[PDB]
Amino acid sequence: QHHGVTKCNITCSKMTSKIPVALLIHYQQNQASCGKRAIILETRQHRLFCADPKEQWVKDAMQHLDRQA
Amino acid sequence: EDATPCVFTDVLNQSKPVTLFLYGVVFLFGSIGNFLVIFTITWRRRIQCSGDVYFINLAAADLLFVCTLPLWMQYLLDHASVPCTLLTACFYVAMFASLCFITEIALDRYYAIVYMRYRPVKQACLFSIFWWIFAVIIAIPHFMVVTKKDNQCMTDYDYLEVSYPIILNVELMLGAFVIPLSVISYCYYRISRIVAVSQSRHKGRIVRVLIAVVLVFIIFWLPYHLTLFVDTLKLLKWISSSCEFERSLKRALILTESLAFCHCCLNPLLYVFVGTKFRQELHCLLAE
Numbered sequence: 001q002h003h004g005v006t007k008c009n010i011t012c013s014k015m016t017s018k019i020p021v022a023l024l025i026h027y028q029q030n031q032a033s034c035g036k037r038a039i040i041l042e043t044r045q046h047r048l049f050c051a052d053p054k055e056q057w058v059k060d061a062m063q064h065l066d067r068q069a
Numbered sequence: 070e071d072a073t074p075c076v077f078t079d080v081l082n083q084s085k086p087v088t089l090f091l092y093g094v095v096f097l098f099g100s101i102g103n104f105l106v107i108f109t110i111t112w113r114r115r116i117q118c119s120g121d122v123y124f125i126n127l128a129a130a131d132l133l134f135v136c137t138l139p140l141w142m143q144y145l146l147d148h149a150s151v152p153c154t155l156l157t158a159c160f161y162v163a164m165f166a167s168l169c170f171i172t173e174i175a176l177d178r179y180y181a182i183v184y185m186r187y188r189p190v191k192q193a194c195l196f197s198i199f200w201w202i203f204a205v206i207i208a209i210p211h212f213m214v215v216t217k218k219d220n221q222c223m224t225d226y227d228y229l230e231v232s233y234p235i236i237l238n239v240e241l242m243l244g245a246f247v248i249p250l251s252v253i254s255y256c257y258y259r260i261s262r263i264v265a266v267s268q269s270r271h272k273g274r275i276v277r278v279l280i281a282v283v284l285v286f287i288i289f290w291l292p293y294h295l296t297l298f299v300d301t302l303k304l305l306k307w308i309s310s311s312c313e314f315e316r317s318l319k320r321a322l323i324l325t326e327s328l329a330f331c332h333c334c335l336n337p338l339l340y341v342f343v344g345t346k347f348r349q350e351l352h353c354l355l356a357e
């Protein structure tokens with residue numbers, strides 16, 4: 001669609017690679033309006049980071065996060 | 070590391086009220102004015118010339134365009150599920166059709182004045198059909214990629230090549246701005262250059278009308294496309310972008326895009342509402 005109508009607020013340039021699995025406090029799924037598959041990670045430092053969804057370690061991080069809180 | 074996400078939430082939250090308001094305005098004056106065009110023509114004077122055909126078609130394109138806006142405002146709130154494909158389709162088709170018929174006005178009057186080529190209502194309807202079809206084929210790359218996912222209108226970029234948004238921006242820039250503006254400017258320049266030296270006593274008003282057309286077109290479409298250009302420059306990696314720059318560019322895009330939508334509200338006052346035919350007197354004068 002056009003620009004006036006957009007529910008995408010997150011754009012990722014790069015991805016975080018591997019660590020760690022304990023620093024995370026919450027995670028958010030990227031908006032559909034973005035059209036780009038990405039995961040948002042909020043750590044204990046209240047810092048946000050981009051992470052590629054199709055990663056072996058990501059699927060293992062979301063596990064601990066979803067199970068814990 | 071540095072994969073820190075560039076958040077855009079505040080920009081959207083701030084742009085939402087303005088966009089909603091402007092959409093409301095455009096729907097108001099647009100629907101009113103253009104339906105008024107159609108009514109005025111259809112009853113006060115059944116199509117007497119090709120100009121009337123093109124005017125009705127222009128008002129129809131504008132109506133179709135503005136009637137999509139309430140749906141978009143309903144979209145902006147609560148992010149109801151209505152097909153994205155069809156709405157985007159009507160959006161871009163109506164837009165491109167509006168631009169096309171705007172060009173066709175200048176063309177028709179150009180061939181009418183200088184080269185003295187005259188088209189009956191029949192041919193005008195034919196060409197109108199042509200323009201609508203051409204408007205649909207040129208809108209295809211703008212809505213055929215749009216789909217509904219998670220109750221949101223999205224363009225799956227990962228499934229498309231990186232060249233696509235650039236090509237789309239370029240096609241929009243030259244197709245919606247460059248080639249209509251160039252044509253209407255050339256045509257109205259020739260027409261004005263002929264009428265200024267014409268025998269008609271009050272040639273002036275004709276020129277003023279045409280000038281007004283061009284000027285308005287510019288002051289409503291140029292900001293948007295000029296933003297599109299630097300956006301393309303960002304996508305083309307010709308310039309460097311920071312998070313703040315991407316934000317500012319986003320805001321600019323949204324706002325100016327909303328600005329460009331009022332042009333269809335100005336269209337009734339530019340051709341149909343303008344008044345008596347000072348051009349018809351010149352028309353009778355040139356037939357000698």
Ligand SMILES: *[C@@H]1O[C@H](CO)[C@@H](O[C@@H]2O[C@H](CO)[C@@H](O[C@@H]3O[C@H](CO)[C@@H](O)[C@H](O)[C@H]3NC(C)=O)[C@H](O)[C@H]2NC(C)=O)[C@H](O)[C@H]1NC(C)=O
Nearest residue numbers: 007008009010027028029031040048074076077078079148
């Ligand atoms: C990017 O924009 C978002 C627009 O709202 C910001 O807020 C997020 O809004 C989501 C609405 O779609 C919330 O969704 C929640 O999803 C859970 C599923 O896990 C549902 O149960 C909840 O009902 C639903 N809540 C609401 C109110 O719809 C997100 O929770 C919410 N996320 C956050 C972090 O507030 C995003 O915040 C914004 N991005 C950033 C980085 O701020």
